[PDB]
Amino acid sequence: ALPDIRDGLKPVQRRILYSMNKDSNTFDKSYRKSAKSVGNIMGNFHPHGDSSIYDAMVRMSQNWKNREILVEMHGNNGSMDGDPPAAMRYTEARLSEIAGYLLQDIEKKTVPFAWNFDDTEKEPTVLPAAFPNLLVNGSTGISGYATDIPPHNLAEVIDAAVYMIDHPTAKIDKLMEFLPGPDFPTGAIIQGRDEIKKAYETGKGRVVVRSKTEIEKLKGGKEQIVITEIPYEINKANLVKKIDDVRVNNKVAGIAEVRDESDRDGLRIIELKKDANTELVLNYLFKYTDLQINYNFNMVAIDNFTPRQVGIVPILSSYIAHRREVILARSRFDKEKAEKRLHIVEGLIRVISILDEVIALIRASENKADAKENLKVYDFTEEQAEAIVTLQLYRLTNTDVVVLQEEEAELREKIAMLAAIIGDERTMYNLMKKELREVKKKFATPRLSSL
Amino acid sequence: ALPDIRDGLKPVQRRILYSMNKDSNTFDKSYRKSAKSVGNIMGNFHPHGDSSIYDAMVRMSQNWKNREILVEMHGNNGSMDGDPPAAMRYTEARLSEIAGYLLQDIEKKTVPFAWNFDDTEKEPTVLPAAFPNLLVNGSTGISGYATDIPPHNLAEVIDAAVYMIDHPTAKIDKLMEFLPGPDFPTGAIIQGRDEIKKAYETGKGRVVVRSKTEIEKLKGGKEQIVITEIPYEINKANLVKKIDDVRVNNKVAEVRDELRIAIDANTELVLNYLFKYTDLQINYNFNMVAIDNFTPRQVGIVPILSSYIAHRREVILARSRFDKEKAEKRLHIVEGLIRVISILDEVIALIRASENKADAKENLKVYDFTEEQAEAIVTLQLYRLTNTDVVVLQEEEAELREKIAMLAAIIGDERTMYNLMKKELREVKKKFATPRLSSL
């Protein structure tokens, strides 16, 4: 129904990503039959029919719907036009590269896990989210009428966040220098800058999305308008007809013929004029048809359990808060994982010094425990002595003692790095900035749609 | 459409077992959700609608349908009467112990496999079967007219099987000293002995089944007829109803239901009427057909059991070939592991003198250690250098030696192999046998 301020995902979308991730259906590995996926998604999680899940998978696999795709589909997923997808038995899919970042650090006991629908598995309430998916991909939902969060540019949302990490009480106008307004994957041209401001602090506003119309003059002293990109959600199926209905049922000037020059390597459309036709005709196509239409914002996401009208300021302020809980947890999990390893490695350094004495001690024993409990002499532990008896002959070679010497150093510096992030939160916030720029530099794509 | 002679299963029934076993949903373990079972069976093996799979899976868990059930269901799947089941949402299931005996030796490269409906995975063409599910559980379908194979007693089928192993040219009469007729999980009594024999040699037979009717003479000379068990495939929902339609439009001389149906100086001719005009006594028709060579074939007792014995030998011959090679690929390793504990210090003090793992394996020209054998030495645990974990390595050498020696004998003589079959079938009989219901 509605997404939450943190990961920006609606319930169904989250189950999809987690399922496909659990089954190891990632970007680097081979595509999987959607029928199997939707079969594991419905069987273990989300039961509300098959045709509710595959519906979501296909939306996430459309670059013309989401700014940065979350699912990658091979087969009929639909075209830039109002074209339909084939059934689940006929397509194969996997996750995108970037989707792996929403799920990155899940194993580290970072996010809260809730109990399954039929109480069998365990599923995440939120995904760790290495990027702010809420502004990046947007949302359309339930709640009164219908919510509308528009998609923004990945790179621009990152900059805004990095600014608000250092400046918590950041004024809305400053943020607008990093994220000036929305960025639609369908392009277009957004107007009303003073109206976008209202959308950013409160959540409502009207903006008007014009199409990037380019005029190129042809033979016989005539002109001819060509639409390079039409607005978001709006299809060129019945809009191409709505423009033809103005000439066939003549309401203006020299509107001659309307021909759709489709999309292959680009969108192309209106051979207007034939000889001396006004461009005041263009204003009729704007005001009457959906060639230009108002996009109303209504930014609502679930906050702390309850739905709440939100703006750019608290969306980002709820994102940074989540990321710190995820990072503080990632670190706490690894500090423990690294201390548990260090101990064993320290004991493994000891058995390398008294090698020949410990060779005879294990040889002159009876069983495994008569080797483990016989390791009273240095003082080893249950897990440390376990680790010595369960060490192989190859680990006692030249290279495997040297690589083991460097693992100790690598481990002690990790614990040292990890203790700083937990101890001082100033440096934790600096890891957040570094990780997000590490994400920006890899997935940044320049903006479409003028302002 | 028709079951397979060898394992007595229809493609859907097989798919259920194979899918459930791979997902570790066996008897010893917990009852896994029915939705997940069907979901995996559909997504990986059978794409012909969910309600066709659950129905098959619900049938193999009803003790009023299959004699020795292959699926075990916790909750509502229907009672002894015509009581309806629940939905896949409200049930949970697993396989029964005896079902595991059909899948016994699956992974041992025993049975032929075939690719998926979408060429994604591998599914078996037949199960390795340790008991003849064709006679033991039967089948009712459509193959011409309708195909019908009745359920029989496990023990009696095994006795007949062991005789057929020892006497290939077995006569139908001698065979009926072991297997005297069908055994329905509903009870009753089967008449027409020579008609059972007609079925066992040809495939078709009209025998007539009758109910178990005992007399209950109550208070003041008044009598009442009590039915203990009604015949097979006959529901008592319509039968108790048609025995009410006879007293309403009185064609004879009350009726209550408790399996127990209870019916002044009325004659014992009502019993004879109710036998001829209702389904309390009906003609059961045999029509034993199954897929042999990839085509339906009308089959008698002898060629059913012949196809079974012929199957069981290839399973065993293939099981033994798998295991002889496994124990050969392991003895070769063990022999090197004893050759090293004799020159203990020389191997420890050579590996330490080496660079890496592979440079230590190449240094094993100290007698001549092979690739797979050298892998085991460098990847050997330090706990395997203690007395008890070296003593067992001498017993292992001996076990592997006696295993190969025992196995090699089974493959080299098609006589001692048959003796292993008889043995195995007798092991199964000893464990799952149950006294027979119904009579002659």
Numbering used by the authors:
A (entry chain B): 29 to 171, 173 to 298, 300 to 407, 409 to 482
B (entry chain A): 29 to 171, 173 to 282, 286 to 290, 296 to 300, 305 to 407, 409 to 482
Please quote the paper that reports this structure:
To gain insight into the mechanism of S. pneumoniae topo IV and its interaction with DNA and quinolones, the structure of the ParC55 fragment has been solved and the model was refined to R = 22.30% (R-free = 27.55%) at 2.7 Å resolution using wild-type ParC55 data (twinning fraction = 0.323, twinning operator = (k,-h,l)). ParC55 forms a biological dimer in a ‘closed’ conformation in this crystal form generating a ring-like structure with outer dimensions of 100×100×50 Å and with a central hole approximately 30 Å in diameter, which is wide enough to pass a duplex DNA. Each monomer of ParC55 contains two distinct regions labeled ‘head’ and ‘tail’ and exhibits an overall structural fold similar to the one observed for other topoisomerases. The N-terminal proximal head contains the CAP-like (catabolite gene activator protein) DNA-binding domain and the ‘tower’. The CAP-like domain is composed of a helix-turn-helix structural motif (helices α3 and α4) typical for DNA-binding proteins, with the active site Arg 117 and Tyr 118 on the neighboring ‘100-122’ loop. The residues Ser 79 and Asp 83, which upon mutation give rise to quinolone-resistant pneumococci, are located primarily within the helix α4 in close proximity to the active-site tyrosine and are oriented towards the predicted position of the bound DNA. In the closed conformation, the ParC55 monomers form a tight contact between the α3 helices with a mean center-to-center distance of 10 Å resulting in the protein-protein interface with a buried surface area of 706 Å2. In the ‘closed’ S. pneumoniae ParC structure, the loop is positioned vertically and stands on the side of the DNA-binding groove orienting the active-site tyrosine towards the expected position of the DNA backbone and exposing the active-site helices (α3 and α4) to the predicted protein-DNA interface. S. pneumoniae ParC55 folds into a similar closed conformation to that of E. coli GyrA However, interestingly, the DNA binding site formed by the pneumococcal ParC55 dimer differs markedly in its electrostatic charge distribution from both the E. coli ParC and GyrA dimers.
